Amino acid sequence: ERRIGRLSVLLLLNEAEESTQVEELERDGWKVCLGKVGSMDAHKVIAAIETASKKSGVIQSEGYRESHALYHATMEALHGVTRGEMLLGSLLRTVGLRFAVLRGNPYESEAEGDWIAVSLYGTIGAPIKGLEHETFGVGINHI
Amino acid sequence: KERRIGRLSVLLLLNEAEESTQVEELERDGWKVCLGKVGSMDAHKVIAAIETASKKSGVIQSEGYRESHALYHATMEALHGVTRGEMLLGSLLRTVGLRFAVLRGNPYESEAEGDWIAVSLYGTIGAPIKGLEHETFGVGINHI
Amino acid sequence: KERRIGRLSVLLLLNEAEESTQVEELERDGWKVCLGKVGSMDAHKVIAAIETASKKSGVIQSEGYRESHALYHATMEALHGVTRGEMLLGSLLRTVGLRFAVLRGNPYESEAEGDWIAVSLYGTIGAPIKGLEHETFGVGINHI
Amino acid sequence: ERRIGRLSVLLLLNEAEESTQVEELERDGWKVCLGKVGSMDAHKVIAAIETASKKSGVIQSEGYRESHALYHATMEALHGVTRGEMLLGSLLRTVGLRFAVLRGNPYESEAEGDWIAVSLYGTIGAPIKGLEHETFGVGINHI
Amino acid sequence: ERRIGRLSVLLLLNEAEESTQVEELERDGWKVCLGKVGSMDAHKVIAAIETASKKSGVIQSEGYRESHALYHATMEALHGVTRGEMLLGSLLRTVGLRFAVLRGNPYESEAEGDWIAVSLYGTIGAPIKGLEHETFGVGINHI
Amino acid sequence: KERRIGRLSVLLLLNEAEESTQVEELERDGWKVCLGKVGSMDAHKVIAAIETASKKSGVIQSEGYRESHALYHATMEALHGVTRGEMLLGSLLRTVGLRFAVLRGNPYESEAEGDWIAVSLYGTIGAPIKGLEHETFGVGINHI
């Protein structure tokens, strides 16, 4: 099972001692990343994600090529967590976002290069009501 | 995590190993599970199929257009996620195999307003180039 | 409100009761009215139709591509409004019945630069689910 | 005639003693709203519209479900009044926007829920020239 | 060769004593414009372009009709220089943009009106690496 | 300007006068040139064609899916530029004639990491109205 798309989502959604899931994928030649953000605002998210990605070894500190792939992978997922009008993710206060990044060779490293994916699991809660909605998103790019 | 129809619904779509075990576990908790596949990525062939699989199996009953509607929208939105932008320009005998999941129930916390319907799809897309496939993923969640 | 081709044009499309009364009232004021229907939501079958209905009835004359052009763009833009995003993924024997209105004249205030052309459409969309229809609405306004 | 789409536009465009048209639709189980704004900027409009909607009884003060439907209904109409690039509605100074909101059961309340629509009639005037352009927009959503 | 699309791009890309190319097209009933900007941010670009266009005789100082056509022509090209998510052109620092505007009658002025085009040639360089990427864009509108 | 595959690639697409002179000039500098035409604006008929013309002429070799892939993406992106938005709603026997250029080599400065592939297209679009054509232009640049 080398689906860089299916894996990430599964990673994002699995709160089953994630520490192990990670090491399992790292040990399987993968670059993993996990995080959270209190906003569905394009900029917030990207900046937040750009850092968690550079700190962990997911992407080089200075490389346009990889940042485009990442940014792009994120924009895709971002159009999903926000139901359609990405701009609307700005207006939503009291929200939360679980992101998961994964980077590696999807085709068993046979005459192929690296790819990248960004899973976004967003929930919209209210002060009284706990959670009012759930949103999913997945961006998948090649480097 | 606790009782989140969308997450549940996805975790169900994504793991296709001992489905009966994960599905009976699901119904056992006041839930309505229905899965299927679609060899098409056409709005009509998908809604038609899902429309039937959902209905054929007690997920939603057939009488008023209401339940039929709350599913439609869930489907539509999840479908809008499947077909996005890179997919926009891929409509020539594209080998499309869509696996789907539908889940009906109430993410009951306390309030218990009414029930929800959560439709999520996950298929693959064959590209014109050899040895290349694209993953698609969509989720529509609507209150019935 | 006073002499606004777009508003006029819309108020004309929307009210289909005693059209001859509202249309003669319109021409009587140095205007050019032309209405029709289209059972298609294809760019070509719409422009072709509108192209003819407009021309067949003295809205625009047939000689240079100019007038034919100023209409095209009006149409195109109003058509871009009809087909938007939710509509994007609805292209399977979708029962589409489009009613349209074209209005040619000058929203003369004082300046009187030249004439305008205002094309607005308003059809319906049948969804795959039963008992469900979607309204579409578009308006293209261009100076000839 | 229960077309929540056709009605609203007709409402927006009719300056025929609107007070009566309203009461007519209210009396016919409809939630009406009317307004104006001097900007075609996404945020302006939405915020402006969000208020006129909550003050009148069109939407609950605290409910994510209805605000999404509203916001969405608006975004649709907003892509229209602005000819295509919604971002461009920001650059346009000296403009004006007449909005009309309507909420109720389009299918005679038979085993069905509420829907919503947002009509936007925008005009672009200049200091010398009165009005240089007219723009129309309609967003229609289900709650 | 009256392709207002092909010309502009050719103009943009040709660093062959551009002064002559211009005069050649001006002398051939064309309104030309050339420029540069250090940002792929929608607003930057448009404002930057709006000025170079009004100063040179490409567009009237006060006219909604021509500014829409221009703005639109730019938005098109702008979605190209930025690979897909125009918003992402904001995040890119250390960039550069060569723009070329052209306005005139594409169909030999026979019973036809003016059109407009905006070529955008953008390069993404880094402090060490010279240039990491090249982007092209073309917006074409009718006035 | 100096050795910029994209600019080169475009300047090549755009000028169709003494191509052999501009192409031999190109190869003479450690480059790989390949041009062609496509009477289609379908994702598959374009990639298929380009796939072959590129491969048929030593631009990219046929063995691993890698090179086939780095071209695909270049193509796809340049194709996404050709089909944009106004084009979105123009899919009825639209007379589409696409001229394309592919260029493979290294925009070698000093670093010489690896080679690049630059695909750019430039066709025309016939509109339903008479005497009307639309220019399309796209460029995809990817590192192999």
CSV table of N, CA, C and O in Angstrom, one decimal, chain B residues 64-66 69 73 142-143, chain D residues 65 107 111-112 115 142-143:
chain,number,residue,atom,x,y,z
B,64,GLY,N,-40.8,10.8,0.6
B,64,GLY,CA,-40.8,12.2,0.4
B,64,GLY,C,-39.5,12.5,-0.2
B,64,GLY,O,-38.6,11.8,-0.1
B,65,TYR,N,-39.4,13.6,-0.9
B,65,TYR,CA,-38.2,14.0,-1.6
B,65,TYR,C,-37.2,14.5,-0.6
B,65,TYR,O,-36.0,14.7,-0.9
B,66,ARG,N,-37.6,14.7,0.7
B,66,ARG,CA,-36.7,15.3,1.7
B,66,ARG,C,-35.5,14.5,1.9
B,66,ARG,O,-34.4,15.0,1.7
B,69,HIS,N,-33.3,14.3,-0.9
B,69,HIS,CA,-32.7,15.6,-1.1
B,69,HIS,C,-31.4,15.8,-0.2
B,69,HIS,O,-30.4,16.1,-0.7
B,73,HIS,N,-27.5,16.6,-1.9
B,73,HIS,CA,-26.6,17.6,-1.5
B,73,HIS,C,-25.3,17.1,-0.9
B,73,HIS,O,-24.2,17.5,-1.2
B,142,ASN,N,-24.4,16.5,5.3
B,142,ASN,CA,-25.6,17.3,5.4
B,142,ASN,C,-26.6,16.8,6.5
B,142,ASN,O,-26.6,15.6,6.7
B,143,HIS,N,-27.4,17.7,7.0
B,143,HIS,CA,-28.3,17.3,8.1
B,143,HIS,C,-29.6,17.0,7.4
B,143,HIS,O,-30.1,17.9,6.7
D,65,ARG,N,-24.7,26.7,10.6
D,65,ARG,CA,-25.5,26.1,9.4
D,65,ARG,C,-26.1,27.2,8.6
D,65,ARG,O,-25.9,27.2,7.3
D,107,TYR,N,-40.6,24.5,-2.0
D,107,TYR,CA,-41.6,23.4,-2.4
D,107,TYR,C,-42.8,23.3,-1.5
D,107,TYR,O,-43.0,22.2,-1.0
D,111,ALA,N,-42.6,18.0,3.0
D,111,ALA,CA,-41.5,17.1,3.3
D,111,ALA,C,-40.2,17.8,2.9
D,111,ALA,O,-39.3,17.1,2.5
D,112,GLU,N,-40.1,19.1,3.1
D,112,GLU,CA,-38.9,19.8,2.6
D,112,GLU,C,-38.5,20.9,3.6
D,112,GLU,O,-39.3,21.4,4.4
D,115,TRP,N,-34.8,27.1,2.2
D,115,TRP,CA,-33.8,27.5,1.2
D,115,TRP,C,-33.5,29.0,1.4
D,115,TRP,O,-34.1,29.6,2.2
D,142,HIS,N,-29.6,26.0,-0.1
D,142,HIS,CA,-30.6,25.3,0.8
D,142,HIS,C,-29.9,25.4,2.2
D,142,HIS,O,-28.7,25.4,2.3
D,143,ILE,N,-30.7,25.5,3.2
D,143,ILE,CA,-30.1,25.6,4.5
D,143,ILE,C,-29.8,24.2,5.1
D,143,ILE,O,-30.3,23.2,4.4
